[PDB]
Design a protein around this ligand. Structure first.
Ligand SMILES: NC(=O)C1=CN([C@@H]2O[C@H](COP(=O)(O)OP(=O)(O)OC[C@H]3O[C@@H](n4cnc5c(N)ncnc54)[C@H](OP(=O)(O)O)[C@@H]3O)[C@@H](O)[C@H]2O)C=CC1
Ligand SMILES: NC(=O)C1=CN([C@@H]2O[C@H](COP(=O)(O)OP(=O)(O)OC[C@H]3O[C@@H](n4cnc5c(N)ncnc54)[C@H](OP(=O)(O)O)[C@@H]3O)[C@@H](O)[C@H]2O)C=CC1
Ligand SMILES: NC(=O)C1=CN([C@@H]2O[C@H](COP(=O)(O)OP(=O)(O)OC[C@H]3O[C@@H](n4cnc5c(N)ncnc54)[C@H](OP(=O)(O)O)[C@@H]3O)[C@@H](O)[C@H]2O)C=CC1
Ligand SMILES: NC(=O)C1=CN([C@@H]2O[C@H](COP(=O)(O)OP(=O)(O)OC[C@H]3O[C@@H](n4cnc5c(N)ncnc54)[C@H](OP(=O)(O)O)[C@@H]3O)[C@@H](O)[C@H]2O)C=CC1
Ligand SMILES: C=C(CC/C=C\C=C\C[C@H](C)CC(=O)C[C@@H](O)CNC(=O)[C@H](C)[C@@H](C)OC(N)=O)C[C@@H](C)C/C(C)=C/C(=O)O
Ligand SMILES: C=C(CC/C=C\C=C\C[C@H](C)CC(=O)C[C@@H](O)CNC(=O)[C@H](C)[C@@H](C)OC(N)=O)C[C@@H](C)C/C(C)=C/C(=O)O
Ligand SMILES: C=C(CC/C=C\C=C\C[C@H](C)CC(=O)C[C@@H](O)CNC(=O)[C@H](C)[C@@H](C)OC(N)=O)C[C@@H](C)C/C(C)=C/C(=O)O
Ligand SMILES: C=C(CC/C=C\C=C\C[C@H](C)CC(=O)C[C@@H](O)CNC(=O)[C@H](C)[C@@H](C)OC(N)=O)C[C@@H](C)C/C(C)=C/C(=O)O
Lengths: 259, 258, 259, 261
């Protein structure tokens, strides 16, 4: 077969599950159903307890969980060396990690703090660069890296503020990584997801406003879910997307195409 | 959920001419995944080739239809007839462009009014009318994919009138996506890198562009019809649910660099 | 050389004045105040009567008016040969011409007629290609060509339908012309104007809706006028914009930058 | 207030951040704004830049040299610098931002090898600087005004060897858009100029810069490179009221290279 979505014999690291609503979990459910071996990474202990509870919903024989705060060079370097020891070589990484201080997001963008801006950049963009460098060690045959972005990296959207500049950074990060790791047969791409109700998104002002605008104005007149992101993640992580790199696929009911 | 099993799916494929046609790469891939395939052609030469090619495939019943997309009638009748012979479809792959060599050889400012509107008619408007008629056979929803080139987004040497046609096509895709979205019809494009085809063979310095892709593109290699077919499988299937008005570059990353 | 907006000794052809509200007239008022010699082109006789009435508002010694319907190779070729005879060599052309059948604009975009689509393409896009070819004859030293576009060429906007695909065609036309005529020191650029109340725009459904959305959502929280387009036209037509070609400048209160 | 279109900048005052020597893009902006009769305030980091500025001001027609030391890495130097400009010359009509930096270690490397410290440094100087400069300069622009920052194509496309600075420029370009939306209601316009390659102090002695200069001459529509003055001309347009109604825009002053592939 030329075209295949059979991921038995494939191993993927999934960074950024927090609870059942996490986009990264949508990616996990889908990759699991297609028979991939899945390694998971988390920051907080609360995410670990949830992960173990969630793995029962999946068909992963062995829970391989690793604590990686992407703010620490060491936790990232050691985390990936340790994954290499425990499961061997991998076929890709799904990156589902962002953070900004609520103080900066609530503010006017011009009021953003130097510390808040560099924090958003560090977690939401630089993380992908170091994750890529370490994961490359486990992908000598080649593989696929995917990161999660939002329209706010391409256009100034109300309230996204500092995270918009972080996502623009991430999106350019993807392109520079694609050009750098291409000759090593490593593809780097992004999924621009439409708004999804998650732990991160719950209790940020006017999120219900954007959900309703998508239903009313977006071509498909509906919102997307974690599984739809997972399906496009399957395409980008598998060899189905061979010849695609430096690309940004909008899984957003067509909202990106309209004005 | 996630599936590349396309048994019980039916797709119309417009624009096979020979074994090198991008549309044939799409056919080979969709066939392997178990889809029922309807084919459309213009010239009789394409029909003879299609029948010879269908032996390479596992299609029980050869359903072939003559549609020159310049004729409202051939398009309207072609699709009504497909609806009668096989019933409702799940999508259309559009693999059709043409411009006069006179216009392509020229300086773009020398382009003829007739040559410009011809390129627009075949290469862009075709998708609008194909979409209108195919919508009749997709009352549950479906996916339409058209084939474009980077030259629709940037001025490329020698693409001339076809660049303005592809920019037209790419905007066509977006307006169709917004129009047919509420009918649960997705409309997307694949921006293929350079591939040696019947259409492309015997346009000067095509080997030069192939070598520039190998040297400068991130993956340091060219793409083929099957790689387009793989991305077509994604866009035509429900794997790409929630993706519409999108342009996916199957071009080894060339679009991302300068 | 050093920076000047003094356009005495410069001559510009302005295509597409119809009445006092025409964007092209905003361009004329501005270029006139800066002391340029202005040649004008029109289609209908109604536009000629209006032009002569309007020229009294300007400081053009000699009225040079020419009938050019851009659908006719002959009217365009002869028009420009005749301009070359009557005023000699020119420094640029401002293109302010578009048209589609209201039947096509009122419809669903998928219902668009083959004749209506090619009509929109012919007047709204191809016109620039042949205008450029003939005007090049009068610009052996070099010059600047500017065409007028709308955001609907970059994004699917409700109700713009066939004219959006025409503007995308125009915008690509600008790029290919810029690459072709660049070596002849001819610059080709576009202005993406925000919504303006004109003869063409008056009595097309939901135009008041877009005007109000611009005031509410656009960065500058206001609409633009013909003169603001004229000011940016002065920049693009003069040597102030040397080194700028294949560019699309949005004169739209920042609406293009947001989502 | 008689010509609708005007490039006469007598009675206008502009802060110009990032002159280092005669080759600096910011100096091209200065020469042009000066010729049009603007009052110019200048900002620098190193003392070497101050000595050069004083030597350069003789080439201009600025009666009183107003020079201020602002390292954009320091909230204090930026806040105090702008308060002090407000005291010495009063309200301003805009800011030209011509400031970027990355460690040569990071630029020479493979982009995937980039250090966390090097990445955040590039972001801090090359992008965040504009956000805080904008916040403080807004205090001196209660009537409104225009802010322009300098970027390169490498913020929009992966270009060989630009590495971490490409991600910094993409950050800057998004910064411009978010600033445009935030400060628009205060009648402050925020725009970028994407300059083609120019021989400057910053650019001199980075490998393969001569390669890109030659590729521009061969492949770009105008078949020629641009200079600091051409950037200055487009800066005059963006800084003056000639560009009224333009904000969140990125104007390529690059002989059309951005339009081709
Ligand atoms: N929800 C949405 O609408 C959209 C989200 N996205 C993007 O999708 C991705 C995931 O978001 P979403 O699923 O909503 O939110 P979640 O609540 O799942 O994600 C937050 C995740 O980020 C992890 N995280 C944050 N900081 C760090 C760090 N320093 N080190 C390691 N992990 C960290 C969290 O771990 P812990 O809790 O253990 O700290 C958690 O797993 C993000 O990049 C987001 O920007 C894109 C478009 C839309
Ligand atoms: N080759 C390349 O590098 C790239 C090609 N593309 C695009 O891919 C698509 C297919 O290209 P390629 O595979 O080279 O094409 P081929 O020339 O191998 O196939 C082209 C098809 O267009 C059909 N066609 C032409 N005119 C009409 C018409 N008036 N009515 C109906 N069908 C028509 C031809 O049929 P017939 O012979 O019967 O006229 C032929 O089947 C085109 O849109 C092209 O622009 C995009 C990027 C790259
Ligand atoms: N108004 C708006 O909000 C916006 C308009 N635009 C674009 O701006 C440009 C100017 O439009 P606007 O000022 O509204 O239009 P006008 O109100 O000036 O009316 C249309 C103009 O088009 C000319 N025209 C139409 N067909 C032909 C032809 N075949 N040959 C020559 N001239 C022709 C008309 O001449 P006549 O009637 O004398 O034949 C007239 O001058 C257009 O290209 C338009 O799409 C862009 C953004 C916004
Ligand atoms: N040259 C080119 O080819 C192009 C350059 N650009 C961009 O134009 C801008 C200026 O470029 P160019 O003329 O080449 O640069 P120059 O090096 O000639 O000037 C660079 C300036 O950055 C200043 N600078 C560096 N760090 C800081 C800091 N922490 N605080 C304040 N100022 C600082 C330097 O001042 P000091 O040395 O005193 O610290 C210097 O004035 C940059 O944004 C660059 O990215 C864009 C396109 C092309
Ligand atoms: C324009 C949108 C509307 C909402 C405004 C801002 C959204 C910012 C998203 C950003 C990722 C949120 C945070 O950084 C959250 C953090 O400050 C507080 N929350 C937490 O710490 C929770 C417990 C954990 C899970 O947080 C994290 N991230 O670890 C953007 C919307 C409409 C689209 C979105 C949400 C895009 C995106 O997620 O990037
Ligand atoms: C920049 C590129 C270099 C190639 C330049 C021009 C090619 C344009 C493609 C266009 C579709 C070619 C024709 O229409 C060919 C036609 O005029 C003569 N040939 C035929 O009629 C044959 C018999 C039939 C089968 O061809 C057709 N089309 O019916 C673009 C290259 C790098 C990539 C390409 C080929 C892009 C594209 O196809 O759009
Ligand atoms: C979303 C928008 C609302 C308006 C929708 C479609 C407008 C298209 C513009 C197009 C040029 C209008 C026509 O062709 C009008 C024509 O059908 C009838 N009127 C005329 O013929 C008059 C007499 C003459 C002068 O008109 C012409 N052109 O010949 C788009 C809006 C928000 C933005 C606009 C108005 C863009 C634009 O005008 O291009
Ligand atoms: C892709 C291009 C080819 C060259 C590659 C990288 C150039 C990056 C520009 C960057 C801003 C320069 C530095 O950070 C150099 C710095 O580390 C060493 N120089 C200095 O420290 C001097 C003393 C000071 C004055 O300079 C600064 N800036 O602090 C990009 C080229 C073709 C276009 C350019 C140069 C764009 C740009 O400058 O942004």
């Amino acid at each position: 077969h030329m075209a295949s979505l059979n991921l038995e014999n494939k191993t993927y690291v999934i960074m950024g599950i927090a609870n059942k609503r996490s986009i990264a979990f949508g990616v996990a459910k889908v990759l699991d159903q297609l028979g991939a071996k899945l390694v998971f990474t988390y920051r907080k202990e609360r995410s670990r307890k949830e992960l173990e509870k969630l793995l029962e919903q999946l068909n992963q024989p062995e829970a391989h969980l690793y604590q990686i705060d992407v703010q620490s060079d060491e936790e990232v370097i050691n985390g990936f060396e340790q994954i290499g020891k425990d499961v061997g070589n991998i076929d890709g990484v799904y990156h589902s990690i962002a953070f900004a201080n609520m103080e900066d997001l609530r503010g006017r963008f011009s009021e953003t703090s130097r510390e808040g801006f560099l924090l958003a950049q560090d977690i939401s963009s630089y993380s992908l660069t170091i994750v890529a460098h370490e994961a490359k060690k486990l992908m000598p045959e080649g593989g696929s890296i995917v990161a999660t972005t939002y329209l706010g990296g391409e256009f100034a959207v109300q309230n996204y503020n500092v995270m918009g500049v972080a996502k623009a950074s991430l999106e350019a990060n993807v392109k520079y990584l694609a050009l750098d790791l291409g000759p090593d047969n490593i593809r780097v791409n992004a999924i621009s997801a439409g708004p999804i109700r998650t732990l991160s998104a719950k209790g940020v002002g006017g999120f219900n406003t954007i959900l309703k605008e998508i239903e009313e104005r977006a071509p498909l007149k509906r919102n997307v879910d974690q599984v739809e992101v997972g399906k496009t993640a399957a395409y980008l992580l598998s060899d189905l997307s061979s010849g695609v790199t430096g690309e940004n696929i909008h899984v957003d009911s067509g909202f990106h195409a309209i004005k």
